[PDB]
Amino acid sequence: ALTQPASVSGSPGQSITISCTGTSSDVGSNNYVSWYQQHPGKAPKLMIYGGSNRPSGVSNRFSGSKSGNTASLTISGLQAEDEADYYCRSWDSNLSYSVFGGGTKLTVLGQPKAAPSVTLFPPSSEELQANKATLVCLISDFYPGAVTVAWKADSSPVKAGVETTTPSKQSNNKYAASSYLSLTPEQWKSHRSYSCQVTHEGSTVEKTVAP
């Protein structure tokens, strides 16, 4: 298909270009090449079309170039928002077959580090009665998405019996993550207190809760 660098980096105000290089039966066979911006969990937004034209409303900081069998997207005046996956698209001369690039993960450097904001909930009464006990640890808006969770029982690593998620690029570029510790409505009562250790970089926040 079309190959583009897996990732790129850049500091605010700076500007980089993402290359999309294909063959002579596609990119090199016409001016039907476009660029899409895809922010986490959202649908792709058309940024450049027909090689260099921008859709109405797209920041002219985005420009598209094309030459030979490769296309180039250049982002200038780099802003934090610009951070997302970028895809290039090609249409054969007949407009009867299109193909996308592998996508390139752009990441804006020099972004302020934030510590996780943790919150731990104890098994609801209702659930307990339903013979189940579930601890819920919601980790919020931190940066980078480099966090590690560890659960304890009274003070001892209740490793295994948990289930954590993967950092998810929130709206405000920071990350979030859940973590659920499932256990018996007996093992919860028959134990002092359970806790959710959330270590991340230097900071290590931990919230404990008890029956």
């Binding site: 649908a43 919150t119 919601l138 954590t164 998620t165």
Partner: protein, 216 residues
């Protein structure tokens, strides 16, 4: 402009029909394109269909087990992928180009999550996450437990409470079932004088669970 049908599970050999309803307003009659994206992977073009001629196009990779049809009578296009294999698990989109201001632009649907699994559709169990103590400001929410497949849609006060809500990404349990939570930040002083309710929708099972939250 483009509204797609809902999420479904389909056994590893079955078929699935995704519907795309062009309900916009337009003087542009371009094709309805179908692009899918498996979790974490990139975009993949499947094919399209020019409504007029009725002529449909298919990327070779899908030729043989995919059929794109348009029912002009309802301005709704359809994409049917068959011989469903596990790698077909993905979000399916429909898109269409159009002229906005002498400049091109292309609208994308919201996509639909087709889960290829030999597992049965299970409705969620909604538990209240009462506030107070470990919550000036207090946090309360709902724990949507053991459901399948994705996704689940958490809302507060039928939609009124659209401020300070935080529905997290689901977590996959060892059991293969899904679990997710949705918290809200609210004024501790408003607690006793405000009714909080999370309306959880799991279309895959046509279930909506309205759970009220509160303390002692």
């Amino acid at each position: 402009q483009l509204v797609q049908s809902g999420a479904e599970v389909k056994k590893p050999g079955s078929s699935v029909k995704v519907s795309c309803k062009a309900s916009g307003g337009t003087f542009s009659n371009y094709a309805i394109n179908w692009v899918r994206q498996a979790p974490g992977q990139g975009l993949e073009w499947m094919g399209n269909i020019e409504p007029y001629f009725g002529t449909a196009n298919y990327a070779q990779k899908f030729q043989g087990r995919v059929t794109i049809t348009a029912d002009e009578s309802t301005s709704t296009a359809y994409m049917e992928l068959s011989s469903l294999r596990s790698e077909d698990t993905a979000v399916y989109y429909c898109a269409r180009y159009f002229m906005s201001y002498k400049h091109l632009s292309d609208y994308w649907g919201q996509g639909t999550l087709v889960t290829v699994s030999s597992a049965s559709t299970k409705g969620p169990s909604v538990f209240p996450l009462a506030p107070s103590s470990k919550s000036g400001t207090a946090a309360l929410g709902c724990l949507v437990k053991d459901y399948f497949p994705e996704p689940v849609t958490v809302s507060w006060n039928s939609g009124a409470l659209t401020s300070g809500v935080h529905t997290f990404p689901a977590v996959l349990q060892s059991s293969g079932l899904y679990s997710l939570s949705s918290v809200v930040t609210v004024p501790s002083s408003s607690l006793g004088t405000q009714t909080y309710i999370c309306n959880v929708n799991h279309k895959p099972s046509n279930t909506k669970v309205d759970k009220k939250v509160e303390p002692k």
